[PDB]
């Protein structure tokens, strides 16, 4: 993390699509670094709905600058998230900020 | 006429600074010795780091294992600070084996009796799943200085290997409080040690590598 | 080591050799050791050091 | 602010330090500007350049 | 190995004049070079022993911003004649030497009566001048036995001198590039040190290896 930023570093995380968000709030219940399962909570159930929700992560692809991209998950097993909370660093990303 | 220097008092106050102090010196000689001591104990030191981990799951560094947490680079870069003292060996192979959901911390490997884990809290992965085991083969190297694995089977993964066991070494001069001379002055030597050494025994060895390096200039 | 445009040298300290020679010949009011008569250069640099 | 700051975590004022040489061992006549600074790295490798 | 390391040569005095020294030491370890410079340097800038002119004893003017009549050069210049003057004494620790000349001419270093233990190392150096022949100077020096540098404002009618008890006059390490076996990241000491006719250079670096060696004769085995 920089240690003197301005603010506007975790706008640039969680608008482009470069890291991994929670659509529906839940808890998460099975952590690794292929995937993310994430149980979602009652409130946000749909009826006819899969039920959880499963994000699949990018573990060293290419990029079209010949640069090593992927994406390495933060949260414990057994965190509350909620909508809109990252669950995955990117490339350049600390818990949800740019990390030059 | 000159005096002495003796090590006499040694203060431990933790587990990883430690304070020496030198004394007697003279006046000019203080701030020279110690910063021979400090560039000597600075520049080459003996050491023993983890140089490879041979793991049967993985294929290379760049791939992932399914029941971790963190990734295999990340394994090797956690081993790569590990801190281990070896007795009398220079080639030891450390196994590692753990079932369960649970961190994998330092006491998970097997004793051996000439190795010394001086810290059993460092943590290594972290297992998510309850039927994911992993098994490596840590192969511990004794050497001296830095170098990278460019310069030195497909399941063997090589790793950079630090030997250096100082972090920093700060010295001051001071005054004698109490002397018969008041020219006479001690100098106070802190170093800071992740413990897989001694710091009488580093000063000792300091000493006789100057000492060593020193023993040319009197053939001239 | 001349320009070809016109007499002068090309070989200049451009920012580093020139504020070292700045700071090293400089004169103060008062410093350390001011007021004493020395025998030659090597004594100077011998002070110095 | 960034004096209260530097006052704060028991931190000079002015924020320069006296610095020792590495090699001689000696005290510098002039304190030196000392701190922590953001630094990048351009995709300029000279692997890719020689 | 791990605890062996690399030795360097001998052989590479260059001498330019009587008493300057030129030596060169390669190869050696990589950052060994400034820790064994810098370390030998401080040794021989102001922790060596000797004997230096300390204070004089004049029966001539009391103050000393003054001048004298009868003779050329000032008060200042025959201090700094004095400064340069090299001398070393044997078995004793102090001494009084005594010059006494009353003539026309310059005064060199063996118009002084020689003694037992007193050696003047170069009798051609020059103290002043007697232009007139009725000025008859008489002096008395202090030669004392000390170490290093000290000046004459930390001292305190005779005249404070700055005594000069180390015999080198400049030192000066410099520290190169050198390379054995593909290894680059070495070094090579350059050591060049311009010396007086009081003692040989290599015998001052001999002195100050055996006094760093004794200084830390405490812990090696």
């Known amino acids: 993390k920089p240690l003197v930023g301005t603010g506007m570093e975790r706008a640039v995380a969680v608008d482009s699509g470069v890291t991994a968000v929670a659509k529906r709030g839940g808890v998460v219940q099975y952590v690794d670094a292929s995937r993310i399962v994430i149980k979602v909570n009652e409130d946000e159930m749909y009826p006819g709905e899969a039920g959880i929700d499963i994000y699949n992560l990018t573990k060293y692809t290419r990029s079209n600058q010949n640069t090593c991209i992927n994406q390495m998950p933060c949260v414990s097993l057994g965190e509350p998230v909620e909508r809109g909370d990252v669950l995955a660093d990117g490339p350049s990303t600390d818990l949800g900020e740019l990390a030059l | ?220 | 080591i001349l320009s070809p445009a016109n007499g002068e040298p090309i070989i200049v300290p451009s920012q580093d050799v020139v504020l070292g020679l700045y700071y090293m010949t400089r004169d103060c009011v008062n410093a350390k050791g001011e007021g004493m008569v020395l025998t030659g250069p090597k004594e100077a640099e011998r002070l110095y050091r | 602010e960034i004096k209260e700051l530097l006052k704060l975590g028991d931190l000079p004022t002015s924020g320069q330090i006296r610095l020792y040489d590495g090699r001689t061992g000696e005290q510098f006549e002039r304190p030196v500007t000392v701190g922590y600074m953001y630094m990048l790295k351009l995709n300029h490798l000279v692997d890719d350049k020689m």
């Open chain 2, 1 to 220: 006429e000159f005096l002495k220097p003796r090590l006499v008092d040694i203060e431990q106050v933790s587990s990883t600074h430690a304070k020496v102090t030198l004394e007697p010196l003279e006046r000019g000689f203080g701030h020279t010795l110690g910063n021979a001591l400090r560039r000597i104990l600075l520049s080459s030191m003996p050491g023993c780091a983890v140089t490879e981990v041979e793991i049967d799951g993985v294929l290379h560094e760049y791939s992932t294992k399914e029941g971790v947490q963190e990734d295999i680079l990340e394994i090797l870069l956690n081993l790569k600070g590990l801190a281990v003292r070896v007795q009398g060996k220079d080639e030891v192979i450390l196994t590692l084996n753990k079932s369960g959901i649970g961190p994998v911390t330092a006491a998970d490997i097997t004793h051996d009796g000439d190795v010394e884990i001086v810290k059993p809290q460092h943590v290594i992965c972290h297992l998510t799943d309850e039927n994911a085991s992993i098994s490596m083969r840590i192969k511990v190297q004794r050497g001296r200085g830095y170098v990278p694995a460019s310069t030195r089977p497909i399941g063997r993964l090589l790793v950079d290997a630090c030997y250096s066991p100082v972090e920093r070494i700060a010295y001051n001069v001071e005054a004698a409080r109490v002397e018969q001379r008041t020219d006479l002055d001690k100098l106070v030597i802190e170093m800071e040690t992740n413990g897989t050494i001694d710091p009488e025994e580093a000063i000792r060895r300091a000493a006789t590598i100057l000492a060593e390096q020193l023993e040319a200039f009197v053939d001239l």
